[PDB]
A paper describes a structure:
S-adenosylmethionine (SAM) is the principal methyl donor in cells and is essential for [name] gene expression, influencing RNA modifications, translation, and ribosome biogenesis. Structural analysis by cryo-electron microscopy demonstrated that SAM-dependent methylation is required for peptidyl transferase centre formation during mitoribosome assembly. Our cryo-EM analysis of the mtLSU from SAM-depleted mitochondria reveals ten distinct assembly intermediates demonstrating how methylation can orchestrate mitoribosome maturation. During translation, peptide bond formation occurs in the PTC, predominantly formed by 16S rRNA during the late stages of mtLSU assembly and involves the folding and methylation of the A and P loops.
States B-D exhibit a mature CP but still an immature PTC, which remains bound by [name]-MTERF4 heterodimer along with an array of state-specific factors, including GTPases, [name] (states B-D), GTPBP10 (states B1,2) and the methyl transferase [name] (state D). The states B-D, with an overall resolution ranging from 2.8 to 3.62 Å, allowed the identification of bound factors and conformational changes in rRNA and protein elements at the maturing PTC. Finally, states D1/D2 represented the most mature states identified and characterised by the recruitment of [name], as [name] adopted a less ordered flipped-out conformation. [name] was flipped-out and largely disordered while the PTC loops between H74-H89 and H89-H90 were only partly ordered. According to the canonical assembly pathway, state D is followed by the recruitment of GTPBP5, promoting a significant remodelling of the PTC loops and the release of [name] from the A-loop post-methylation. The lack of GTPBP5 binding in our model can be attributed to (i) an absence of A-loop methylations at U2481 and G2482 (U3039 and G3040; human [name] genome numbering); (ii) a clash between the unreleased [name] (due to the unmethylated A-loop) and incoming GTPBP5; and (iii) an increased disorder of the PTC loops. Thus, in the absence of mitoSAM, multiple causes result in an unstable interface, preventing the binding of the Obg domain loops of GTPBP5. The short segment of PTC loops that is ordered is likely scaffolded by methyltransferases [name] and [name] Overall, our results suggest that the P-loop and the proximal PTC loop are distorted without methylation, inhibiting PTC formation. In addition, we show that the 2′-O-methylations of 16S rRNA are crucial for proper folding of the PTC and further maturation of the mtLSU.
Residue numbers in the entry:
A (entry chain r): 35 to 41, 47 to 196
B (entry chain I): 36 to 196
C (entry chain N): 30 to 57, 69 to 132, 147 to 251
D (entry chain 4): 65 to 101
E (entry chain J): 18 to 192
F (entry chain k): 13 to 96
G (entry chain l): 52 to 133
Write the structure that this text describes.
RNA sequence: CUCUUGGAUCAGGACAUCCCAAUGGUGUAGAAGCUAUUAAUGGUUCGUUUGUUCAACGAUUAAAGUCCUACGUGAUCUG
RNA sequence: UUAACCAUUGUAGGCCUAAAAGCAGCCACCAAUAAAGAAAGCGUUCAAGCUCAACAUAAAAUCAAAAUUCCAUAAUUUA
């Protein structure tokens, strides 16, 4: 971990970083997720795994540093958004530059939010019996996850 | 407009749809099969011979980083070196590494990082080589070997005298 | 180390004397239903347009194809041929049409060129046709047939349309047409189903 | 801001963005090229 | 700033093509053509001569000039009248191999920088392309009597060429 | 930018960004772009980490060590400082 | 506009001297030295068309140099239509 | 070869907007204009037939919008 | 199949085209150099000028799930 310090004269000092726990349960796995046998068994609720790929201000890290394959990178990125929108990462809020303050509005509780709350239109004309317009819940990218229910999960509510 | 199908016929189509089989393990996450050995095209072998000849024939090799001089200003340096019968050599970095790994010179690899150019001749006109370097001040010299002796820029200047 | 490799050569190609497309005269229902029996394979060139639906081509369509191809093609290095009959079926007579079936090559191009060069123009011409069509080549056309064979062999569904229809399981033939036994559920009206196995 | 069925880049400088639920092609050099879906 | 032109020494004043643009940069336009003309007096003239005039913020005239174009130089060597429009089957000058060597003994010395063009192949192949680019076929060797036989054919061929142009020109005038 | 000073030691295997940064600084278009700068290159043989020094006539001096700073940060700081 | 027409009339002079060589009005037209007085490689230049890719050896620069040009030719062919 | 609409009164509603309102581009100098996006808020005139196959004319207006509602509406009236 | 960096010359190739110079054509299409098409585009009255491909240096890796006033309530995992 390298921090740039300005004393104008500026310099950057490298510091030690904690290392991955030894003995991966499944060596020979190319991506870190595969190495630990977590391919289809994580969801937005799993902050402990997700936080490890998050910058101090909530951004995603680039693939090259993380080493994730394309498929897992997209999944983790999507799950992070839902974790932010669900208020599960309170200490990774955006930085306020000089005098900006949080809007101070009431917070509506959410979970499994696919889209950005700002830009979704209301459903003014809902449909009839089998012509109903559906309200999406969850993300399509996580379709293949392990399911403990008799029938596949209901994405459209 | 597609004519609607009797509900009984619709039920038949739903049950007879194609189903693909799925593998147990995805191929990408599995370890990769060994790649077939690459075949050396007739560029490295011909290039390989050229680098061997220039290193063996030329006693002195001076390595300098490429400074990307203009073509109009590049010509005069070649002409000045041509007047001194000194030649400029450049080769891809990839093909340069294997020889420096197994050759008379093996400690020059740290110098051989990034864009680099080689000054080769058959006579030790080092003073002219340094003199032609003084024409361009910004261009630095990383050193190299003269008369089969490895030395840096500071030693070459004193060697010229 | 940018790896150069030998370039493909067209030393085997020969350009016909009459490169350009000739003019089609204005003047000389199961026809468009079902699979094509004619002009289903590459004859002279390596590129062509492949229909995926049953439709009628009137004279206006022919000129649109002729002018577009003739304007762009270079006589020195390119040639084009007509792969379909001229309008012959009278419609009340107001105009004549040429029936087209799924799997019919409409126009075929060749010469000292690669598929990538002609993809854009052929696709543009195909979009304007009255039925859905896509530009294809010898390699691409063969791959589709090879893919179809693979799908049948590896299909994991124990029940298929053909077995049930022929054996009249459920008395299903009460609700079916004679053609269903032949087409085996891959054709419905004038429409071709690309994923039905 | 012509709204068109298919949005296509028209010059080298054209770039694409996803704002407020729709796809945009925006070119600073030529404001003529601005489009919405 | 390097500016390259092929203006001929015989005519020293193109004018609007050069003077204004150079004047826009800022130059002594009247001096430039006169300076070109006095150079024309010193050396041969009437032939397209490449130039490498340098224009700088200092506004210093530095003309660089030398031996003329290869094509015209070869035209005298091979007795070539000039280029022909077709250039596909057009044949004007056929010259000996030895003659090719001797003409280029000092011509290649006109290089702006002392290019080490030791192989004359580089020049002959360029001239082969140049001649073919012109209305010229360059054969290995031509006999003088063969030239006369072709010249009779060329005169008849040229006369027919003029008649074809006249018929087209007359038709265009009517249109 | 009135003056720009770059120093590095080749044979020691250490930061390379500086050498590439020197190449970018020692670029004909760049040297024309910041014409006011005087380009100077001095190779050294001691065991000293590369040091980049930018000197201004106004007296502001910007010293930059590639020891752990990447070439991108070198230019980024340089651009902002030139603005002031 | 006064492009010089065909010049000279003597085949022997054309093969033993060359009037057009002179580039100085003061300078005289040069005359040709003996054949033996020129190097052999000068007379051994390739008077035919350039060797094709088939003829050239795959391990020679000329073979690959033409291959590089052909690849550029192919790129332009593909780039033309876009 | 042929053969239900007007008006008065009172209006309910759609947006595919005529005016009023917020915006993007221009072959947008200003002033006029041409084109596109968003929005249904209230409004949207008075007289007249020589010729004109479901037309026209005079004077005005910020504007004199396009349509649906068994001619919207005759147990409210009328040609 | 790509994202990083770049560009010297025989000569402005002939051709009624003033000139049409890689680019109106029109046939040829060769040259040097490690590496550069008598040029894949723009753009110039023609020229200039901007790009592409080349120079070294890098990295990634096909189709599909409108007009009265919205109209059950809700819901992603227990074998
Ligand atoms: S998780 Fe191993 S490569 Fe995808
Ligand atoms: Mg109302
Ligand atoms: Mg609207
Ligand atoms: Mg009533
Ligand atoms: Zn644009």
């Amino acid at each position: 971990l390298r921090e740039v310090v300005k004393i104008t004269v500026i310099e950057g000092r490298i510091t030690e970083t904690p290392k991955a726990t030894p003995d991966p349960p499944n060596p020979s796995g190319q991506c870190p997720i595969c190495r630990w046998n977590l391919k289809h068994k994580y969801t937005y609720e799993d902050v402990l795994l997700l936080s490890q790929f998050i910058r101090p201000y909530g951004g995603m890290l680039p693939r090259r540093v993380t080493g994730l394959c394309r498929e897992e990178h997209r999944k983790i990125e999507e799950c992070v958004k839902m974790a932010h929108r669900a208020g599960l990462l309170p200490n990774h809020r955006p930085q306020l530059p000089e005098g900006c303050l949080p809007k101070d509005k009431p917070k509506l509780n959410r979970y499994l939010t696919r889209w950005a709350p700002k830009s979704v239109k209301p459903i003014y004309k809902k449909g009839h019996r089998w012509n109903k317009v559906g309200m999406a819940v969850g993300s399509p990218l996580l379709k293949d996850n392990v399911c403990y229910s008799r029938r596949p999960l209901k994405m459209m509510h | 407009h597609w004519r609607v199908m009797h509900f009984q016929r619709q039920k038949l189509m739903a049950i007879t749809e194609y189903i693909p089989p799925k593998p147990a393990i995805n191929p990408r996450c599995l370890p990769p099969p060994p790649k077939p050995p690459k075949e050396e095209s007739g560029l490295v072998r011909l290039l390989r011979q050229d680098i061997v000849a220039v290193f063996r024939d030329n006693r002195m090799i001076a390595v300098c980083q490429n400074v990307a001089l203009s073509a109009e200003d590049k010509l005069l340096l070649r002409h000045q070196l041509r007047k001194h019968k000194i030649f400029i050599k450049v080769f891809p970095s990839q093909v340069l590494k294997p020889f420096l790994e197994n050759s008379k010179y093996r400690n020059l690899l740290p110098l051989f990082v990034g864009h680099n150019l080689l000054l080769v001749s058959e006579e030790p006109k080092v003073k002219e080589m340094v003199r032609v370097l003084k024409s361009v001040p910004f261009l630095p010299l990383l050193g190299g070997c003269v008369d089969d002796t490895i030395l840096s820029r500071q030693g070459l200047v004193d060697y010229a005298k | 180390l940018k790896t150069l490799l030998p370039v493909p050569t067209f030393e085997n190609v020969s350009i016909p004397e009459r490169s350009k497309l000739k003019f089609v005269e204005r003047v000389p229902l199961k026809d468009i239903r079902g699979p094509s029996t004619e002009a289903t394979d590459f004859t002279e060139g390596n590129f062509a347009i492949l229909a995926l639906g049953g439709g009628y081509l009137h004279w206006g369509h022919f000129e649109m194809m002729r002018l577009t191809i003739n304007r762009f093609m270079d006589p020195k290095n390119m040639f084009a041929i007509w792969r379909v009959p001229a309008p012959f079926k009278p419609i009340t007579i107001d105009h004549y049409v040429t029936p087209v079936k799924t799997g019919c090559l409409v126009v075929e191009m060749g010469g000292r060129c690669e598929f990538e060069e002609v993809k854009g123009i052929l696709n543009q011409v195909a979009h304007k046709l009255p039925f859905p069509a896509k530009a294809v080549s010898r390699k691409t056309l063969e791959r589709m047939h090879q893919n179809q064979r693979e799908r049948e062999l590896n299909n994991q569904n124990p029940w298929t349309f053909e077995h049930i229809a022929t054996a009249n399981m459920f008395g299903i033939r009460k609700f079916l047409s004679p053609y269903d036994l032949t087409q085996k559920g891959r054709y419905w009206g004038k429409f071709y189903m690309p994923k039905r196995v | 801001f012509k709204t068109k069925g298919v949005i296509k880049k028209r010059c080298k400088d054209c770039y694409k963005v996803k704002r407020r639920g729709r796809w945009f092609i925006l070119c600073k050099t030529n404001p003529k090229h601005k489009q919405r879906q | 700033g390097v500016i390259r032109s092929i203006v001929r020494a015989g005519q020293a004043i193109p004018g609007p093509p050069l003077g204004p643009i150079l004047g826009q940069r800022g130059v002594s336009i009247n001096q430039f053509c006169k300076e070109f003309n006095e150079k024309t007096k010193d050396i041969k003239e009437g032939i397209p001569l490449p130039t490498k005039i340098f224009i700088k913020p200092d506004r210093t005239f530095e003309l660089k000039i030398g031996q003329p174009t290869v094509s015209y130089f070869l035209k005298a060597a091979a007795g070539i009248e000039k280029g022909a429009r077709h250039t596909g089957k057009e044949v004007a000058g056929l010259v000996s191999l030895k003659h090719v060597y001797e003409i280029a003994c000092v011509k290649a010395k006109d290089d702006a920088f002392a290019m080490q063009d030791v192989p004359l192949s580089s020049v002959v192949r360029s001239i082969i392309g140049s001649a073919r680019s012109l209305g010229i076929r360059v054969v290995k060797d031509l006999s003088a009597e063969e030239l006369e036989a072709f010249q009779k054919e060329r005169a008849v061929f040229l006369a027919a060429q003029k008649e074809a142009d006249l018929a087209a020109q007359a038709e265009a005038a009517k249109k | 930018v009135k003056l720009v000073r770059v120093q590095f030691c080749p044979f020691e295997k250490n930061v390379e960004s500086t050498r590439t940064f020197l190449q970018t600084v020692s670029s004909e278009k760049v040297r024309a772009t910041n014409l006011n700068c005087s380009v100077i290159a001095d190779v050294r043989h001691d065991g000293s980490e590369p040091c980049v020094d930018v000197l201004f006539g106004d007296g502001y001096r910007l010293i930059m060590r590639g020891a752990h700073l990447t070439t991108q940060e070198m230019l980024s700081a340089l651009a902002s400082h030139i603005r002031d | 506009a006064l492009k010089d027409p065909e010049v000279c009339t003597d085949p022997t002079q054309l093969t033993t001297h060359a009037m057009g060589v002179n580039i100085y009005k003061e300078g005289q037209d040069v005359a040709l030295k003996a054949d033996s007085e020129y190097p052999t490689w000068l007379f051994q230049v390739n008077l035919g068309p350039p060797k094709k890719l088939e003829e050239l050896e795959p391990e020679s620069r000329e073979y690959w140099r033409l291959l590089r040009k052909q690849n550029i030719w192919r790129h332009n062919r593909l780039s033309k239509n876009k």
